[PDB]
Amino acid sequence: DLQQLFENNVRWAEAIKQEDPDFFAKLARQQTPEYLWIGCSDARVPANEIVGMLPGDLFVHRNVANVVLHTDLNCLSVIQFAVDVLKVKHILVTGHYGCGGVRASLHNDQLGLIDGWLRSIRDLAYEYREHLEQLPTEEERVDRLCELNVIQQVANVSHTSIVQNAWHRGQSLSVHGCIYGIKDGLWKNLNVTVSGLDQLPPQYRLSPL
Numbered sequence: 007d008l009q010q011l012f013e014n015n016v017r018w019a020e021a022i023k024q025e026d027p028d029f030f031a032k033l034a035r036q037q038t039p040e041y042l043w044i045g046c047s048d049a050r051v052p053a054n055e056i057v058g059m060l061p062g063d064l065f066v067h068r069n070v071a072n073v074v075l076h077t078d079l080n081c082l083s084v085i086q087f088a089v090d091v092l093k094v095k096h097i098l099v100t101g102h103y104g105c106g107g108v109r110a111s112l113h114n115d116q117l118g119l120i121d122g123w124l125r126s127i128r129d130l131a132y133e134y135r136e137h138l139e140q141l142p143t144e145e146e147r148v149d150r151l152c153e154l155n156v157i158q159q160v161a162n163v164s165h166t167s168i169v170q171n172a173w174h175r176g177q178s179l180s181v182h183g184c185i186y187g188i189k190d191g192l193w194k195n196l197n198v199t200v201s202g203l204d205q206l207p208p209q210y211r212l213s214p215l
């Protein structure tokens with residue numbers, strides 16, 4: 007029954023209008039979010055609510071297991087629009103514990119199309135197989151891989167020519183990695199923030215255009 011959503015929407019918009027009748031009118035005149043959220047599609051990880059933001063505050067991309075690929079124009083176009091046009095100051099790469107996408111990457115069932123999408127996470131599980139082997143439970147392995155994934159995705163974002171060129175031209179921009187706890191509602195910093203070219207390995211740095 008869709009009717010509940012439509013009715014919910016009317017109630018929400020009208021309620022807002024009575025507290026501030028110009029709320030949407032002002033918002034609609036320009037888009038000026040300071041943040042881009044790159045997160046998982048998981049229904050339990052809604053960006054605005056988790057960090058207490060309002061409409062207008064967060065440009066958002068969400069996909070299964072918050073994966074950022076350098077050949078993916080879907081995610082890359084959100085990043086490029088955020089960085090080059092909206093000039094967001096921060097990119098929030100937020101993964102979450104108990105991520106089904108990450109979990110799937112540790113198991114050997116075929117899920118179909120998504121098998122290809124999760125390849126880079128499967129690669130990570132292989133790269134860190136020694137580390138993950140020393141963890142006794144499946145849940146610990148999944149949760150650690152969730153962290154490792156966020157840290158990798160922060161690297162993937164920072165290595166884009168989109169981000170590096172923003173830096174080359176003196177634009178202020180930081181990429182952060184955070185992880186959300188679906189079990190406790192807490193959004194935690196993984197402390198892997200990148201804010202400049204000097205923090206990149208030489209093998210990944212691009213010369214200015």
Ligand SMILES: [Zn+2]
Binds near residue numbers: 048107108
């Ligand atoms: Zn997820």
